[PDB]
RNA sequence: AUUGAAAGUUCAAAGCUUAGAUACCCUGGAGGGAAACCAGACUUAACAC
């Protein structure tokens, strides 16, 4: 099963606050990164279970298909305008 | 003009008394919340050429 030992955000959450910002994903760099629509692209470091064998994001971003059916997997809009604590937002950038 | 005439089978009198529709008796036995079903379909737009 999939198991996210941890993920290492409270860097993403500070740039996130008092904003609604599009929090956009690419795993390609062999690093995550989390890129921000605000204008800025923090790198992810981050622990899972699954070990994504540096062919599989070759084949996900030559492939023009998958990397279409792969916007759906990929972003959120926080909206953190209005009352945001940090917790719930560490849960929506986890999931 | 008769072995006749005359003569109320009448009177008094409670179908009453005692007496438990009760006794025994499992709504139980048998019986699959199952049957069918794709987490899938697809790229498009823009300008450059």
């Known amino acids: 099963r999939f198991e996210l030992s941890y993920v290492e955000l ?19 760099d062999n690093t995550l990164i989390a890129e921000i629509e605000g204008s800025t692209k923090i790198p992810i470091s981050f622990k899972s279970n699954l070990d ?15 990397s279409f059916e792969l916007l759906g997997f990929k972003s959120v809009e926080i909206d953190a305008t209005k009352i945001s604590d940090k917790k719930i937002l560490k849960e929506i950038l986890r999931d």
Do not use: A, E
């Open 10 to 28: 409270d860097k993403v959450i500070d740039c996130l606050r008092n904003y609604k910002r599009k929090v956009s994903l690419d795993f390609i």
């Open 52 to 66: 994504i064998d540096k062919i599989i994001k070759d084949l996900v971003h030559n492939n023009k298909l998958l």
